[PDB]
């Protein structure tokens, strides 16, 4: 039973498309046409964080909007003090090819991972000495692409084995596994309430997962290429995604489909990082064209450009209070924009 | 007050710079290599007092298009060829035309016919290169056809930004090719190439 099962799957996909279209009587652009546009948004490089030896692929802001951690393929996990540019920690990495980094919400812990398949979590409390590798999270057969702390106890990590995993740091074992994805999962974002998270994979599909049940409740397939970045809207009911098809798309957890698309004729390069502002009105997207474009989440137009980096921008993070934006790139420098 | 903690933070940053500078010294001298043909193996070998740190991936999924983007800053990519030959040729074609690997030269190692490649009937042994002693003319023709089938892909859209160095099977050859790549990059910085 393969052919008729495939036909049944296609039929239910058509039914889901019909159900989604039954709600798409009016588009986001039509209802948001009456908005006064924000306009041309200027942003200047307040601080240029220098010291990384190789390209920078991941970055994460702290909850206090002061400390941020960055990961580089040279084998370093450097923690930066944003206000004074002085580095606080320079953690050596046992694996050179780190591809993800996470900063604990309380700031007591920091994590990294990559081709090694171990998501190494380093303690920052340092009761006796300096930073130490508190726990090593082995079990993935792909490559650690993204990870975000729910708390000091549990973390959610994405890998190239097309599965995401929730880990208990104290025991080091997986709590639940998210095996729904079929392609390389490249990015995950936790909701502000940490009850749900959505992850984009290389199958052009975005799947919403529940951390408690470990079960996929919604799936979004609005993209035409592999999704490289994803981030929830600050209200927790929507999320924007970035893929190599040079288009940014916004999906709603209630409409169960794409709301609006952020694309331009002259942009033919993929998106590597997406992040919302404090209000969620501004959508900042990293691009392969050496530049970052600030998109109005409602008007779907380029409200600003962050072109200060001389190489591919790979990571992009907005402060939890929205004070400033740190932009990471392959040029081994981080730039603070506000 | 604020001054004491500011001075402490600046001293910590100064120590971090002191460590990072030595680590930069050891990083620049080490030539990273990617081998294809934990989730990754590392083999350290040294020739003429310069260290080469070659990477070979282990437990990785066959869709390599994403995680291979980390190897865009390596000194060179080492390609090993063991029909499997057509698959290796297309793999090399994908590596050569990769968006982020355009600046990375490829070191090619060739190993182990007529019906898989119709153009082998019209192929002739090149005159610019000489065979090893004791080699049969047919074996030389076959191996040079295999080399040229990779080279024609290498000469397509090369633009001089990166070059392919074919070899028949060494570590000394890897060192020589890496030195040639470094020299070419330095000359290109001085606009002499």
């Amino acid at each position, epitope marked *: 039973e393969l052919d008729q099962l495939r036909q049944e799957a296609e039929q239910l996909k058509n039914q889901i498309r019909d159900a989604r279209k039954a709600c798409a009587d009016a588009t986001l652009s039509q209802i948001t046409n009456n908005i006064d546009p924000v306009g041309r948004i200027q942003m200047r490089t307040r601080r240029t964080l220098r010291g990384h030896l190789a390209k920078i692929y991941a970055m994460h802001w702290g909850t206090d909007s002061r400390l941020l951690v960055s990961a580089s393929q040279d084998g370093k996990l450097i923690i930066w003090d944003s206000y004074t540019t002085n580095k606080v920690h320079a953690i050596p990495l046992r694996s050179s090819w780190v591809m993800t980094c996470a900063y604990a919400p309380s700031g007591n812990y920091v994590a990294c991972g990559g081709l090694d398949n171990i998501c190494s979590i380093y303690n920052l409390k340092t009761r006796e000495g300096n930073v130490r590798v508190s726990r090593e999270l082995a079990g993935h057969t792909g490559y650690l692409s993204c990870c975000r702390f729910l708390d000091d106890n549990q973390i959610v990590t994405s890998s190239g084995d097309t599965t995401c995993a929730l880990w208990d740091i104290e025991t080091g074992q997986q709590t639940t596994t998210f095996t729904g994805h079929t392609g390389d999962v490249m990015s995950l974002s936790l909701a502000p309430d940490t009850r749900l998270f959505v992850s984009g994979a290389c*199958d*052009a599909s975005a799947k919403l997962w529940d951390v408690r049940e470990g079960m996929c409740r919604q799936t979004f397939t609005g993209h*035409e*290429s*592999d999704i490289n970045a994803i981030c929830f809207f600050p209200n927790g009911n929507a999320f924007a995604t970035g893929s190599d098809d040079a288009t940014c798309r916004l999906f709603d957890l209630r409409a169960d489909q794409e709301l609006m698309t952020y694309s331009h004729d002259n942009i033919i390069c993929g998106i590597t990082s997406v992040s919302f502002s404090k209000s969620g009105r501004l959508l900042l997207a990293g691009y392969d064209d050496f530049n970052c474009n600030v998109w109005d989440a409602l008007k779907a137009d380029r409200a600003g450009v962050l072109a200060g980096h001389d190489n591919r921008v790979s990571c992009l993070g907005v402060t939890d209070d929205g004070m400033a934006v740190a932009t990471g790139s392959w040029d081994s420098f981080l730039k603070i924009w506000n | 007050d604020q001054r004491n903690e500011e001075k402490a933070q600046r001293e910590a940053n100064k120590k971090i710079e002191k460590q990072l500078q030595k680590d930069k010294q050891v990083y620049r001298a080490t030539h990273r290599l990617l081998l294809l043909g934990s989730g990754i193996f590392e083999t350290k070998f040294q020739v003429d007092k310069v260290n080469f740190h070659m990477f070979d991936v282990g437990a990785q*999924r*066959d869709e390599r298009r994403k995680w291979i983007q980390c190897f865009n800053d390596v000194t060179a990519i080492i390609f090993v060829v063991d029909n499997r030959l057509q*698959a290796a040729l297309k793999l090399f074609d*994908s590596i050569w035309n*990769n968006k982020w690997l355009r600046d990375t030269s490829v070191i090619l190692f060739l190993n182990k016919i007529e019906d898989y490649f119709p153009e082998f009937a019209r192929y002739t042994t090149p005159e610019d290169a000489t065979p090893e002693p004791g080699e049969d003319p047919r074996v030389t023709r076959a191996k040079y056809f295999i080399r040229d089938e990779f080279l024609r892909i290498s000469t397509a859209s090369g633009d001089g930004r990166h070059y392919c160095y074919p070899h028949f099977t060494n570590i000394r050859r890897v060192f020589n090719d890496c030195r040639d790549i470094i020299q070419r990059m330095h000359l290109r910085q001085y606009e002499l190439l």
Partner: nanobody
Amino acid sequence: QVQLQESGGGLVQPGGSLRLSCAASGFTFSNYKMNWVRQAPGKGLEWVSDISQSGASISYTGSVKGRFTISRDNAKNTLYLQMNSLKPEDTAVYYCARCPAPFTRDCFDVTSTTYAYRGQGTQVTV
């Protein structure tokens, strides 16, 4: 949603002709390079032929050089693969695959781990 619906196949006498057409949807056909791969019984997936975005670049394997020709019609989002002089060994499940990212020349779609941007395949028996 990116979807590829290959059509045509079944049984064909050796030395005959058979035309393969796949209906592409969920993406802009013109901006992505697409190729054909096949999986014969007892062996893994093997690439067959590719065609550029506008059809300017065309290549084939030596096993099907001359015999097979590839073509694309950007007007109605369709890709074609005309097969001539079918050898007995040419039997395989023919899969049409798409380049993961637009405007790129590289392809990594010969993966046996169920590459996402590849159709369900139509059985071809010679």
